[PDB]
Every structure is written in structure tokens, then in C-alpha cells.
Coordinates of C-alpha atoms and ligand atoms in Angstrom, one line a residue:
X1 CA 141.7 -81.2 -130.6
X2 CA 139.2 -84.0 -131.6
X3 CA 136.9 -84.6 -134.4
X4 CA 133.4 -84.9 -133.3
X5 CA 131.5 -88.4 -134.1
X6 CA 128.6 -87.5 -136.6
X7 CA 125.2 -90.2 -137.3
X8 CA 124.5 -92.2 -140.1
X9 CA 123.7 -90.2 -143.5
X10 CA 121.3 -90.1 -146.6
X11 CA 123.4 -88.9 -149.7
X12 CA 122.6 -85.4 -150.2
X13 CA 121.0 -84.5 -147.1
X14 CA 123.2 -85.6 -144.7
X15 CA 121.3 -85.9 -141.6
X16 CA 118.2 -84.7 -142.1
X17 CA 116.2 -87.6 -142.7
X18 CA 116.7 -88.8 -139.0
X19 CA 114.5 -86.1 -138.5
X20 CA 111.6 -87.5 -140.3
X21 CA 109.9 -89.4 -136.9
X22 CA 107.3 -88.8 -134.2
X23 CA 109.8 -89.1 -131.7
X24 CA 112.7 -87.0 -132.4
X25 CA 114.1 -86.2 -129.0
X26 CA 113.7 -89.5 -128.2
X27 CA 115.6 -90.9 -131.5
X28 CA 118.7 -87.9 -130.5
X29 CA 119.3 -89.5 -127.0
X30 CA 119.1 -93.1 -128.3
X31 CA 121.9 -91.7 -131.0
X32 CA 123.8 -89.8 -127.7
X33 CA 123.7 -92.9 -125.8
X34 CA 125.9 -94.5 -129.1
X35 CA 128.1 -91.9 -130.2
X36 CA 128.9 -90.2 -126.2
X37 CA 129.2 -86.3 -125.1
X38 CA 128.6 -84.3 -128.4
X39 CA 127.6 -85.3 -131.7
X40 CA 127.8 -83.1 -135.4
X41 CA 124.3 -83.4 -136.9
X42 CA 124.0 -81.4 -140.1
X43 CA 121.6 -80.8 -142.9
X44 CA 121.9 -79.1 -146.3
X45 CA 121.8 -75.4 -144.6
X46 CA 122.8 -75.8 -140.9
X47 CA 125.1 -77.5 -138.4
X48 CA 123.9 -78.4 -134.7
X49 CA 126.2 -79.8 -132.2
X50 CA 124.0 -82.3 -129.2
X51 CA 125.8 -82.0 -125.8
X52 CA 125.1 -84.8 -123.1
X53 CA 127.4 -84.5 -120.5
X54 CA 127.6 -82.1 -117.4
X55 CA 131.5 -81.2 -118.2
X56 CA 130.4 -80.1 -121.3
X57 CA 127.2 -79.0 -120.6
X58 CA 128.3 -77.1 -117.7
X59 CA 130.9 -74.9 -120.0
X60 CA 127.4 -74.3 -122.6
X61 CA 126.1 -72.9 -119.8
X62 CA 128.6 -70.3 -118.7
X63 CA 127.0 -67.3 -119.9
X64 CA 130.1 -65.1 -120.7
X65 CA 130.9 -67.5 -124.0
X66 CA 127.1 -68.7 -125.1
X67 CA 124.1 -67.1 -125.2
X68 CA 120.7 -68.5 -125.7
X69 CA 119.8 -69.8 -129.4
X70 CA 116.4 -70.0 -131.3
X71 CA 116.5 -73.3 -132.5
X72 CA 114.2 -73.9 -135.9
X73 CA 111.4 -75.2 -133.8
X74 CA 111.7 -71.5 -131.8
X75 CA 112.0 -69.6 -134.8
X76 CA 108.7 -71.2 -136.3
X77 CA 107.0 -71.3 -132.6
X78 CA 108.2 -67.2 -133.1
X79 CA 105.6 -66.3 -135.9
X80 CA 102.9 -67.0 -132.9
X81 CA 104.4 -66.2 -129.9
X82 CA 106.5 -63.1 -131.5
X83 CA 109.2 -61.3 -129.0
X84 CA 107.9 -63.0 -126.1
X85 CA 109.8 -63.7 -123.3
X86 CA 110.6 -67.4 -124.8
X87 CA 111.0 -66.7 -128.6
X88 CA 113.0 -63.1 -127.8
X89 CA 117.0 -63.0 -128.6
X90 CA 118.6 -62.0 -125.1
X91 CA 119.6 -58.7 -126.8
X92 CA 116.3 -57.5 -128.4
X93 CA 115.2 -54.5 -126.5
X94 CA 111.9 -56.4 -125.2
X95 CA 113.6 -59.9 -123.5
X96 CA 115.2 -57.7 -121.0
X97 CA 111.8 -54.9 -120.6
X98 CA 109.4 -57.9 -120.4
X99 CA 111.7 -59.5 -117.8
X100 CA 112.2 -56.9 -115.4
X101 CA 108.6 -56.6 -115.6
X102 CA 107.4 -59.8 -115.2
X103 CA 109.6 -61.0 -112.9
X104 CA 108.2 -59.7 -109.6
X105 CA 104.8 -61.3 -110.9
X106 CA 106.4 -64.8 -110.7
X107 CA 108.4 -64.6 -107.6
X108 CA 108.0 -66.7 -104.5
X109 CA 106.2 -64.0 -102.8
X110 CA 103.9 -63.3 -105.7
X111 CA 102.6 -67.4 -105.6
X112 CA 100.3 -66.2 -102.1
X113 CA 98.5 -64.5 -104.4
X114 CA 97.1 -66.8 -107.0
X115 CA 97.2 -69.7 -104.3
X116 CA 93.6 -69.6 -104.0
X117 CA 92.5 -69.5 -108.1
X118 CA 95.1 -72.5 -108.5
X119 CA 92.9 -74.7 -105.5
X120 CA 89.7 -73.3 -107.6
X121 CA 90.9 -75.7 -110.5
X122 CA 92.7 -78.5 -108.2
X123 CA 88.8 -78.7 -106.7
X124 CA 87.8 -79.2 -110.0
X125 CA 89.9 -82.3 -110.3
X126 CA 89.3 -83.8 -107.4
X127 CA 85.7 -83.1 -107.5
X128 CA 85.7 -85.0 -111.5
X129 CA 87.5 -88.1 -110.2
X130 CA 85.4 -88.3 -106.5
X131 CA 82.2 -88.5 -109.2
X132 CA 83.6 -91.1 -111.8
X133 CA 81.5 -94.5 -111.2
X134 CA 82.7 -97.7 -110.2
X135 CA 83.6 -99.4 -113.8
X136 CA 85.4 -95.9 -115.3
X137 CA 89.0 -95.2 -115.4
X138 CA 91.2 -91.7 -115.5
X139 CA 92.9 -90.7 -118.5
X140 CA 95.6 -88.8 -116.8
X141 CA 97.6 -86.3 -119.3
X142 CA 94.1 -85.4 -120.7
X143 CA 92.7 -84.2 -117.1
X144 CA 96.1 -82.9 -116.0
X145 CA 96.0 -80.8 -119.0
X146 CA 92.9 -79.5 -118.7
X147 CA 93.9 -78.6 -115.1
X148 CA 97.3 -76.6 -116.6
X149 CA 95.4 -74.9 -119.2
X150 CA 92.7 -73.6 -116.9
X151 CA 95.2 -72.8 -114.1
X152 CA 97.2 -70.2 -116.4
X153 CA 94.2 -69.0 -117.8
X154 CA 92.4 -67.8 -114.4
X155 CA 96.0 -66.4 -113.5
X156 CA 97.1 -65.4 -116.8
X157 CA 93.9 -62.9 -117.8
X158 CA 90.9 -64.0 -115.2
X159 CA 89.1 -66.0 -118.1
X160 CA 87.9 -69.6 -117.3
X161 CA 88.8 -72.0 -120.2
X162 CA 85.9 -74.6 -118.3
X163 CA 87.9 -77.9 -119.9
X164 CA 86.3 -79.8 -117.3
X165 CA 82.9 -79.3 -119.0
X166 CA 83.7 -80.4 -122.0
X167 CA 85.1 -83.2 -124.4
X168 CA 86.2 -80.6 -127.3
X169 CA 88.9 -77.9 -126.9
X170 CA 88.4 -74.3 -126.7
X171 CA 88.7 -72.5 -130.3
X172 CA 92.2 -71.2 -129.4
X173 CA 93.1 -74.1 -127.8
X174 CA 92.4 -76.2 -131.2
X175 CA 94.0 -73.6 -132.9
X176 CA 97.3 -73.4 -130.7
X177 CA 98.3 -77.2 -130.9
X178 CA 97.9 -77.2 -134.6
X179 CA 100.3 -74.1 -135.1
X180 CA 102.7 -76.0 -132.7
X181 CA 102.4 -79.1 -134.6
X182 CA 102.8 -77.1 -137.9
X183 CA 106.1 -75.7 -136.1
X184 CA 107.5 -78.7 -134.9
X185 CA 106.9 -80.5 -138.2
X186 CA 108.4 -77.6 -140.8
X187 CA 112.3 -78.0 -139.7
X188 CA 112.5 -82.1 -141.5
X189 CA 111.1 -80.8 -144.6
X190 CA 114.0 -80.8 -147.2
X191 CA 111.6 -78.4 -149.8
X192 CA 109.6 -76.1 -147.3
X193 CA 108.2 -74.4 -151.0
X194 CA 106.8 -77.9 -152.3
X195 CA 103.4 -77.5 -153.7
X196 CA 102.0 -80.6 -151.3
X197 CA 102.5 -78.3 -148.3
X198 CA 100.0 -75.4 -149.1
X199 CA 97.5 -76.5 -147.5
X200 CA 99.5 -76.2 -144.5
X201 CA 100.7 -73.1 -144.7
X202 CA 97.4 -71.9 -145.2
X203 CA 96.1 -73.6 -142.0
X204 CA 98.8 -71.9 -139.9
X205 CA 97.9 -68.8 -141.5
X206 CA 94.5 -69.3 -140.1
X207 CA 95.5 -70.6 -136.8
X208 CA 97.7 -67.8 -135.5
X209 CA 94.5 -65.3 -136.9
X210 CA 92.6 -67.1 -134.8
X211 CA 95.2 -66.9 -131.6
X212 CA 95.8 -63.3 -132.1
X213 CA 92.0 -61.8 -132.8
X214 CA 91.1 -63.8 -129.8
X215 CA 94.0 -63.0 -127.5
X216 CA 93.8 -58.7 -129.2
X217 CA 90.0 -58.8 -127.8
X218 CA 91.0 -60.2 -124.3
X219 CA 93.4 -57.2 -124.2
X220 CA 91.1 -54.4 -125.1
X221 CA 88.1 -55.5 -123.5
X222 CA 90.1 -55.5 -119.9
X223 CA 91.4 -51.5 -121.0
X224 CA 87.5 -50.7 -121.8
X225 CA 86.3 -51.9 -118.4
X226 CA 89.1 -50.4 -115.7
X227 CA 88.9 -54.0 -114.1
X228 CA 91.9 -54.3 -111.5
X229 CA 91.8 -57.7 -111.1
X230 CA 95.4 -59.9 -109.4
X231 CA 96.7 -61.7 -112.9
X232 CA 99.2 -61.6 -115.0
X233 CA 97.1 -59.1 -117.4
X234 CA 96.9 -56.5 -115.0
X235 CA 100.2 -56.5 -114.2
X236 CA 101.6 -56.4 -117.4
X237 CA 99.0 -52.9 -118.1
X238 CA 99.9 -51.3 -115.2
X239 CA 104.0 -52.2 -114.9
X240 CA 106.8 -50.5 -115.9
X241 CA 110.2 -51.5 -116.4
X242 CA 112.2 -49.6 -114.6
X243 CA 115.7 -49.3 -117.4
X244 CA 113.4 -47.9 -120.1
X245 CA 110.9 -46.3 -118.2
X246 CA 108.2 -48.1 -120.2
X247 CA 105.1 -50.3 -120.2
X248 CA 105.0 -53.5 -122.2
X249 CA 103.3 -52.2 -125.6
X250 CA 99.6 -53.9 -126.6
X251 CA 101.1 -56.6 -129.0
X252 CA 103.8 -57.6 -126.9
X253 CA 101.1 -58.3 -123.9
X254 CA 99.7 -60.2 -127.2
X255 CA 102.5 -62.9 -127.5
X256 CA 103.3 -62.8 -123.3
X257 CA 99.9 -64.2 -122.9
X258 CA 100.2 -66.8 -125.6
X259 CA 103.1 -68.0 -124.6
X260 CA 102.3 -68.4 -120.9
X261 CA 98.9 -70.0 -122.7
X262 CA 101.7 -72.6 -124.5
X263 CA 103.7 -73.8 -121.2
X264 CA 100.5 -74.1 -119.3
X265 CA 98.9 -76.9 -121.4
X266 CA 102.4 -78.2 -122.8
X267 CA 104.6 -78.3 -119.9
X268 CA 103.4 -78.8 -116.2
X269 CA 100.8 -81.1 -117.4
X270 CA 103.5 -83.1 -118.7
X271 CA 105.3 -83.4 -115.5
X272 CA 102.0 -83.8 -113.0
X273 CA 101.5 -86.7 -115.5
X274 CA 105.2 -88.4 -115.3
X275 CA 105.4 -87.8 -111.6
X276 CA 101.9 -90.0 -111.6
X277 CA 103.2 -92.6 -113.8
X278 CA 106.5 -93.5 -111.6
X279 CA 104.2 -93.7 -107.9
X280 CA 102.1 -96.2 -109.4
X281 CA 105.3 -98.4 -110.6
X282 CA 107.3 -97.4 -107.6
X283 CA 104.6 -97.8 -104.0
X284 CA 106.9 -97.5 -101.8
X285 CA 107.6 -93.9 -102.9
X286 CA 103.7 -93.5 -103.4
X287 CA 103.1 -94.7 -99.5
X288 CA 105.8 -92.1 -98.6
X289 CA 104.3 -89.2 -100.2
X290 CA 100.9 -90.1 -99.6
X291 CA 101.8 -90.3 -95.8
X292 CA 102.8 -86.6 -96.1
X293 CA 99.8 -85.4 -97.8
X294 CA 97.8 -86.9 -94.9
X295 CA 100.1 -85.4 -92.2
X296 CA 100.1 -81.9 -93.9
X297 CA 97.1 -81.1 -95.7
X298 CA 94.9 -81.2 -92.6
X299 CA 92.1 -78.9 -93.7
X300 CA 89.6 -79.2 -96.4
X301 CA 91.0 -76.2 -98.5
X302 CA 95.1 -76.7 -99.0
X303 CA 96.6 -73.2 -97.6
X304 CA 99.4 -71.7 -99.1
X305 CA 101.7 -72.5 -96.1
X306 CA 101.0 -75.6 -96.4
X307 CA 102.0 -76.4 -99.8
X308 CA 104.9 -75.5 -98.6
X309 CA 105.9 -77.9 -95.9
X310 CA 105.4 -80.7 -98.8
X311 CA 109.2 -81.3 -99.1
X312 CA 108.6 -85.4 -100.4
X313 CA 106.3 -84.4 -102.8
X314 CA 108.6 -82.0 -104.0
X315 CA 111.6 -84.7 -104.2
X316 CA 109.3 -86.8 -106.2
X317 CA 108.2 -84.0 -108.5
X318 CA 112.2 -82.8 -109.0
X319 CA 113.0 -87.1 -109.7
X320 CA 110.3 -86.9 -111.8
X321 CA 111.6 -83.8 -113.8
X322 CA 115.3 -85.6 -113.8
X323 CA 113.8 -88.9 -115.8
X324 CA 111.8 -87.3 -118.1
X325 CA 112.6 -83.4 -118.4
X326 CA 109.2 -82.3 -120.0
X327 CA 110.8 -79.7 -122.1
X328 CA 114.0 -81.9 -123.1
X329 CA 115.9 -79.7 -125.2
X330 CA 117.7 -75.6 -124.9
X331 CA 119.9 -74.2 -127.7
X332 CA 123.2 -72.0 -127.5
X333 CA 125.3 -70.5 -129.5
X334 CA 128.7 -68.9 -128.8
X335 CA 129.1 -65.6 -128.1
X336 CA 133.3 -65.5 -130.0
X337 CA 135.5 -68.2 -131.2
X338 CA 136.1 -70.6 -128.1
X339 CA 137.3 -74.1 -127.3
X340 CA 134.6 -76.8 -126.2
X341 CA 136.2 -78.8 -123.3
X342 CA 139.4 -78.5 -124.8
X343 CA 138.9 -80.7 -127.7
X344 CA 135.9 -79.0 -129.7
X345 CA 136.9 -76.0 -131.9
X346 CA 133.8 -73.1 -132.3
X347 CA 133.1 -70.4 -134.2
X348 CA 131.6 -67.4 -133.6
X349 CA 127.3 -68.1 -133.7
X350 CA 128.3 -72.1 -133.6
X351 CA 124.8 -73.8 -132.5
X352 CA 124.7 -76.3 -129.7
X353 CA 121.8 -78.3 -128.4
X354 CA 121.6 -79.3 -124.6
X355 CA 119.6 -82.7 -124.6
X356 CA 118.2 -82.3 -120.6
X357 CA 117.5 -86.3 -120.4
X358 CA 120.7 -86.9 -121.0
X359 CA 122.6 -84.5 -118.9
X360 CA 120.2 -86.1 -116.2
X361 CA 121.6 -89.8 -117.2
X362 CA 125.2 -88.5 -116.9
X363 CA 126.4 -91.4 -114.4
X364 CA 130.2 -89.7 -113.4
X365 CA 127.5 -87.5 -111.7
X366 CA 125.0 -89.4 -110.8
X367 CA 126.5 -92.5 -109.9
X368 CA 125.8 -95.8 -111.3
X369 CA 122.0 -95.8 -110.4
X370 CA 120.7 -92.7 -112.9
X371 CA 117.4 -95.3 -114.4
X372 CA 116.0 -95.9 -111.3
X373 CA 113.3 -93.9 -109.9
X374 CA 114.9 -92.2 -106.4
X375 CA 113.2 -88.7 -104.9
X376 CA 115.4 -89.7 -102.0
X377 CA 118.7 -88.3 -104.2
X378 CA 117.0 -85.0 -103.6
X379 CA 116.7 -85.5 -99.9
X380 CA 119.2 -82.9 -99.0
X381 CA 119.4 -79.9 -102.0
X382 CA 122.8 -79.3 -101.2
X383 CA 124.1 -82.7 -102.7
X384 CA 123.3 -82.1 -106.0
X385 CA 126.2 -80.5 -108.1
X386 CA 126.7 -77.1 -110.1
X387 CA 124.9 -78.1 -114.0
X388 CA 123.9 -81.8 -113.3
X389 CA 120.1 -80.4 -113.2
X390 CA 118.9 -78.0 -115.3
X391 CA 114.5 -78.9 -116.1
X392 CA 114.4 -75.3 -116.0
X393 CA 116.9 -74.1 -118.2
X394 CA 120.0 -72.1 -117.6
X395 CA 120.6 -68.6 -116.4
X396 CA 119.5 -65.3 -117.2
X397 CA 117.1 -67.5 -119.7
X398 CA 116.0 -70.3 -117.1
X399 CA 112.3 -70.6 -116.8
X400 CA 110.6 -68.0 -115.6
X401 CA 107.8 -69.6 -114.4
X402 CA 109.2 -72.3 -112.3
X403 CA 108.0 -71.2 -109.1
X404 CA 104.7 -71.0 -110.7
X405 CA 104.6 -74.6 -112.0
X406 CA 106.2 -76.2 -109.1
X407 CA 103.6 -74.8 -106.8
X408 CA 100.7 -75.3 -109.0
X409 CA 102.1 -79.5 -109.3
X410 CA 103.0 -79.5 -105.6
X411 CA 99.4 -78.4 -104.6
X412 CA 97.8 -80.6 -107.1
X413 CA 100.0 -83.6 -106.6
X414 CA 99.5 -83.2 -102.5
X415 CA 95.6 -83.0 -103.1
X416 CA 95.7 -86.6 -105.3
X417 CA 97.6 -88.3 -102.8
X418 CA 95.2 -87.1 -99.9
X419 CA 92.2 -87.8 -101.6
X420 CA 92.7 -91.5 -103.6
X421 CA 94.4 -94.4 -103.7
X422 CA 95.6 -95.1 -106.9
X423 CA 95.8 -98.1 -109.7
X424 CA 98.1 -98.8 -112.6
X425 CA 94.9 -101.4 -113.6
X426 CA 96.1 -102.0 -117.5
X427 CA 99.7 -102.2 -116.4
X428 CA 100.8 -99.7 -118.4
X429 CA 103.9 -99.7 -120.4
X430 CA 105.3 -96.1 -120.7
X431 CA 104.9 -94.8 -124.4
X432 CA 106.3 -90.7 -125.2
X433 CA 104.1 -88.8 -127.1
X434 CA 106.2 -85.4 -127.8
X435 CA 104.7 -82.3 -129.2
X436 CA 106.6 -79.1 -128.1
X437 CA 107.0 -81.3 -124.8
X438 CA 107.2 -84.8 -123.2
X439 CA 103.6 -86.7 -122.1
X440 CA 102.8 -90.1 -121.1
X441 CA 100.1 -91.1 -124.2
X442 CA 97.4 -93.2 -123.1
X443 CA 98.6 -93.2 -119.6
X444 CA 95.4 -94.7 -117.9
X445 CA 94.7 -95.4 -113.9
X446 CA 91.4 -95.9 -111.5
X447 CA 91.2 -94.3 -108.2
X448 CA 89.6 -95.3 -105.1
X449 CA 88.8 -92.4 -102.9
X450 CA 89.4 -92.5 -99.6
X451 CA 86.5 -90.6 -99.0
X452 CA 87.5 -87.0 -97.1
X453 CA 85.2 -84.3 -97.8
X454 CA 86.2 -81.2 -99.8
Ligands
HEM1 C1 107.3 -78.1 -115.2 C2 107.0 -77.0 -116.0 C3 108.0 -76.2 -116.8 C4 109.2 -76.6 -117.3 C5 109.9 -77.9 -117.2 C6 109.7 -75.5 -118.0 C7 110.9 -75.4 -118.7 C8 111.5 -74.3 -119.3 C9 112.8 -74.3 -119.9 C10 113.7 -75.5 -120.1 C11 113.0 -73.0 -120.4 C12 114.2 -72.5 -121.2 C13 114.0 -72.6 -122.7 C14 115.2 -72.2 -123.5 O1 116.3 -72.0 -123.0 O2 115.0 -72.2 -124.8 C15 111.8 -72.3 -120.1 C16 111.6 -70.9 -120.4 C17 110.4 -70.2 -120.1 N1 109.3 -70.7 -119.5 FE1 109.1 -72.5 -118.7 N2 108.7 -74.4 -118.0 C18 107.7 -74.9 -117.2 C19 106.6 -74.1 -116.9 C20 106.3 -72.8 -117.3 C21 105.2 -72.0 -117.0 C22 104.1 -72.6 -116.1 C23 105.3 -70.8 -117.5 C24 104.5 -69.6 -117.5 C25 103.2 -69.6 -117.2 C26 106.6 -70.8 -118.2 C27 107.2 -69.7 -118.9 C28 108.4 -69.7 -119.5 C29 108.9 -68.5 -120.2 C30 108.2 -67.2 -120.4 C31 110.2 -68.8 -120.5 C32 111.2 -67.9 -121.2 C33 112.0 -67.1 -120.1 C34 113.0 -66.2 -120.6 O3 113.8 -66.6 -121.5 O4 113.0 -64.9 -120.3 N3 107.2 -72.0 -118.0 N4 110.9 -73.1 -119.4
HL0_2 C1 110.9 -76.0 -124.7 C2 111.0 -77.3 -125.3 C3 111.6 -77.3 -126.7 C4 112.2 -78.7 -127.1 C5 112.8 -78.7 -128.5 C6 113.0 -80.1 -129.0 C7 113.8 -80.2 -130.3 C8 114.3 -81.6 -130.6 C9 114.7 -81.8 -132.0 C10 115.7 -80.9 -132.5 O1 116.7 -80.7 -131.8 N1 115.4 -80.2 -133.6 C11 116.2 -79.2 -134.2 C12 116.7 -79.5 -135.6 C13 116.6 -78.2 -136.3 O2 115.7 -77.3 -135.6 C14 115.5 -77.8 -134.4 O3 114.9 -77.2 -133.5

């Protein structure tokens, strides 16, 4: 039985002013990396325990002593996104409706079907960069986001964001990152009820109005018209869970579309852009993937199959996910009074944090070489160990749309490497702009295509 190692402090409020930065997950591994496996971080009100190491993270994660946690962020993310499959508790009645629901709709299997709206927006892409002039560069977290956002939204409810023809976002879209920003920003403020931020709670006010009139019409103007089309939206009206017997209820539709709205334009885009950024500093992985993409993706339109045989551009997207997980962070809490690693008394609804970019740095799994960019350490699935990997979260509460991502950044990701050569022109020094996730800011490249049709 150990006392747990605890960061520097500011009188009053404890830790809470380490908080008070732009890049807070990036500040809580650089305190991990001083103070080891699990650090106490507390603040006048609340007590969070930071776990970094598999053998630690790999008890967090057994899901007979924790359960998921809402984290502040989650519970503020939670007055937009409501009892939604990501800001539900694992025992309100609609987490486990939702999932059984959902779940066939995000399956292996169920990717064949919106294969051919995700190569609708890859074409897009490629068609925006084949078109850029000699002197012009690519930005390359804002065009992968516009590709996420648009993806999810064809799948999602058949409507067609069109954020390749144009500079300004979507009303919902403007509206969305500023209640996200709002939420990240509300759990460093020591007086949530100071007079300075009104104006901000007014705004947030505004912005989920916004999110929910627009999302409510979506919803009712699909039940008007009978329309049977293959998304997300028709299978949410026309499922049933099979345990209750009952379709998801208007409103919850409501918050399942915006948050699959939320991980499209916060998540994969993040990860298409990191898995750019380490083949232009790495070209020997870059010739390697881009010799697959050649050798696979034989025919102007990728199929579905063929996505599929892309195993290297896989291994670079999974390396990419270990670096830089591009949603760091899950929270726990335990189920009874337990024992952490047999050191680390708990109580009964004890919070613990798992920081993913850690975990993924933990060398007495690794090995010795964990900064180093490697898709080869995925070259054979079955040599990577029980907890060491976790981008998608853990258990009954891991990611439900991972296949969905991974196929949309495999198919995206295959059709770069076919069609360009790339740049890193500016020599780019990495810089980690985080909202609810991870991106490369100001990530820039040119391309040279190589000139096969479309
Ligand atoms: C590379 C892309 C993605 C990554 C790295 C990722 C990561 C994660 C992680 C870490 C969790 C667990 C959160 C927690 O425990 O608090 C999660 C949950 C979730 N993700 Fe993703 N996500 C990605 C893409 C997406 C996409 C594209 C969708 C849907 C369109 C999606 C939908 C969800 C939902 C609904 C949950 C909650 C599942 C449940 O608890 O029932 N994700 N994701
Ligand atoms: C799905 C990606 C979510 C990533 C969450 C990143 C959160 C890192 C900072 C952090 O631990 N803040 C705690 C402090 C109190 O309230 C929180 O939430």
C-alpha cells in the first residue's frame, strides 16, 4: 500500500490551475512521464487518478470492478449530445437499447453498404488536389475534415454538408465546435457562476438551439416523406431492440445523430491527418504503402474488396493511432471498494483517467523503441499483447464505430497514395492543436500527381 505521487499545487485550488492551457492532454502526459504509472490530481470538488501503464491500465479495464465514467468534459459534451450512445451511463435504459440497435448498422458486414457513398466523398478529394495549380499547397486537417464531416453526413442521414464548395462551415457545423469548445473550456473555471462568463453561457444556449432545431427537422422531414434510404437514419426509424421490444424514441435519434456528427469531424480526420504527417517524415514507409496502393487499387473506382486487401496501409494507420491516439483520454470509475495493482486503495465511484498516449509509450511492453515511427510492429496482429492498444476504447464501451473509421481512412488513405506523390515542402515541425481530439495545426504539404485518371 503506496501513496500516490500528486503535481505541483496553487494554494487553495490544489491542482486546478494546471488546467488552465491549450494543451491539456498534452501537459498530463508530460506530468506522467515525471511522476510514472498513476498520479492524484485534485481540485476544490473532485479527485481524478491518471493511469499510464498497461499493468495498471489493464486492471481499469476489467469490466467486473470499473465501469465507464463521464468525465466533466462528457458531462458538459452531455447537454448536446444527451443519452447518446457516448454521453449515456452503461446502466441508463437507453446505452444498452441504442446499442443493440445500432450495432448491426456498424458491423463489418454493414461497411459494403456505404462503401460506395464513402468513394463519393474520397472522389471529392482527389478530384480538389488533381485541380490545385502548380504554386498552391494542401492544408491537410482542413480537407481531411471536410472529407470526415461529409462522409458521416451522407451515411449518417443522406444529407450532403458540400465542405468542399466552400471556405465557411455549415450553420451546425459553426455551431457544434463552439458548444465543444464551450465544454472543454468550463471544467478549469474555479467560479463557473462569475459574472464575466455570461456571455458564454448564453452562446451555448444558442448553439445547442441551433444543433437541435436543425437536427429535429432532419428527423421529421425523413418521417413526412416514407424515404427508405441505406443510412444510419433509417435504420434507427425502422429498428428495434430486441430486450425492450422498442424503437429508439425521436429525441434520442436527436443526440445519436449528433454525436456520430461529433466523431466524424473530430476524430477520423484527426488520424487521416497524423497517418499523413509520419509518411512524409518517414519515406521508406511512404514507398511501402504507396507500392501497395498501386498493386491493389487497380481500377478507377476502389471496390470494397479491395479496401480490404490493404493490410500496410492499415499497419501504418494502427502506428499512427499508437503515437498519437486522436481521442487520448477514457474515464472509469469503480464499480466497489478494490485494490489498484496492489498498492492503490479505491473507493466505491473512485474516478480514474486512462491517458491512451501513454499506455502506447509503455516500453516493458513495447520495448525500448516506443518514439519511433514502425507499422511493421503490427505486421503480425497476434504479437501485440492483451491492453497495450486501446485507440478505441475498452469493452462493452469501445468505439462503436471503428470499423466505420478504419474503413473510411483505409479507403481514403489507399486513394492518396495511388494518386500523388507527396511533399513535406515547409518542413514541418509537428504542433497539437486539441479540441475534443488530437490534430496536426497548420500541417501543410504539395502534391504531385501521378496522373491516373479517376
Ligand atoms: C479514428 C477514429 C475514432 C477513434 C480513435 C474513436 C475513439 C473512441 C473511443 C476512445 C471511444 C470510447 C470513449 C470512452 O470510453 O469515453 C469511442 C466511443 C464511441 N465512438 Fe468513436 N472513435 C472514432 C471514430 C468514430 C466514428 C466515426 C463514430 C461514428 C460515426 C464513432 C462513434 C462512437 C460512439 C457512438 C461511441 C460510444 C460507444 C458506446 O459507449 O456505446 N467513433 N470512440
Ligand atoms: C473522446 C476524447 C475525450 C478526451 C478527453 C480529454 C480530457 C483531458 C483533460 C482531462 O482529463 N480533464 C478532466 C479534468 C476534469 O474533467 C475532465 O474531463
Amino acid at each position: 500500500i503506496k501513496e500516490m505521487p500528486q503535481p505541483k499545487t496553487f494554494g487553495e485550488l490544489k491542482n486546478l490551475p494546471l488546467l488552465n492551457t491549450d494543451k491539456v492532454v498534452q501537459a498530463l502526459m508530460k506530468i506522467a512521464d515525471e511522476l510514472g504509472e498513476i498520479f492524484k490530481f485534485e481540485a476544490p470538488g473532485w479527485v481524478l487518478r491518471y493511469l499510464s501503464s498497461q499493468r495498471l491500465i489493464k486492471e481499469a479495464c476489467d469490466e467486473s470492478r470499473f465501469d465507464k465514467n463521464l468525465s466533466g468534459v462528457l458531462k458538459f459534451v452531455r447537454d448536446f449530445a444527451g443519452d447518446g450512445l457516448f454521453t449515456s451511463w452503461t446502466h441508463e435504459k437507453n446505452w444498452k437499447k441504442a446499442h443493440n440497435i445500432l450495432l448491426p448498422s456498424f458491423s463489418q458486414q454493414a461497411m459494403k453498404g456505404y462503401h460506395a457513398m464513402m468513394v463519393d466523398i474520397a472522389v471529392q478529394l482527389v478530384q480538389k488536389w488533381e485541380r490545385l495549380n502548380a504554386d498552391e499547397h494542401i492544408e491537410v486537417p482542413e480537407d481531411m475534415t471536410r472529407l470526415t464531416l461529409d462522409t458521416i453526413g451522407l451515411c449518417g442521414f443522406n444529407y450532403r454538408f458540400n465542405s468542399f464548395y466552400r471556405d465557411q462551415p455549415h450553420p451546425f457545423i459553426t455551431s457544434m465546435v463552439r458548444a465543444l469548445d464551450e465544454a472543454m473550456n468550463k471544467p478549469q473555471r474555479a467560479n463557473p457562476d462569475d459574472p464575466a462568463y455570461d456571455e458564454n453561457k448564453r452562446q451555448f444556449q444558442e448553439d445547442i438551439k441551433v444543433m437541435n432545431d436543425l437536427v429535429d427537422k432532419i428527423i421529421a422531414d425523413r418521417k413526412a416523406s416514407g424515404e427508405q434510404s441505406d443510412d444510419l437514419l433509417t435504420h434507427m426509424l425502422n429498428g428495434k431492440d430486441p430486450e425492450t421490444g422498442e424503437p429508439l424514441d425521436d429525441e434520442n435519434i436527436r443526440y445519436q445523430i449528433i454525436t456520430f456528427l461529433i466523431a466524424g469531424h473530430e476524430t477520423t480526420s484527426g488520424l487521416l491527418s497524423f497517418a499523413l504527417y509520419f509518411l512524409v517524415k518517414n519515406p521508406h514507409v511512404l514507398q511501402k504503402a504507396a507500392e501497395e496502393a498501386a498493386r491493389v487499387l487497380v481500377d478507377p473506382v476502389p471496390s470494397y474488396k479491395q479496401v480490404k486487401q490493404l493490410k500496410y496501409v492499415g499497419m501504418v494507420l494502427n502506428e499512427a493511432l499508437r503515437l498519437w491516439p486522436t481521442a487520448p483520454a477514457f474515464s472509469l470509475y469503480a464499480k466497489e471498494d478494490t485494490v489498484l495493482g496492489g498498492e492503490y486503495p479505491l473507493e466505491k465511484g473512485d474516478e480514474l483517467m486512462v491517458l491512451i498516449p501513454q499506455l502506447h509509450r509503455d516500453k516493458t511492453i513495447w520495448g525500448d523503441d516506443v518514439e519511433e515511427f514502425r507499422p511493421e510492429r503490427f505486421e503480425n496482429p497476434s504479437a501485440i499483447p492483451q491492453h497495450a492498444f486501446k485507440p478505441f476504447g475498452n469493452g462493452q464501451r469501445a468505439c462503436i464505430g471503428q470499423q466505420f473509421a478504419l474503413h473510411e481512412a483505409t479507403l481514403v488513405l489507399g486513394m492518396m497514395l495511388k494518386h500523388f506523390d507527396f511533399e513535406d515542402h515547409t518542413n514541418y515541425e509537428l504542433d497539437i492543436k486539441e479540441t475534443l481530439t488530437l490534430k496536426p495545426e497548420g500541417f501543410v504539404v504539395k502534391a504531385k500527381s501521378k496522373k491516373i485518371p479517376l
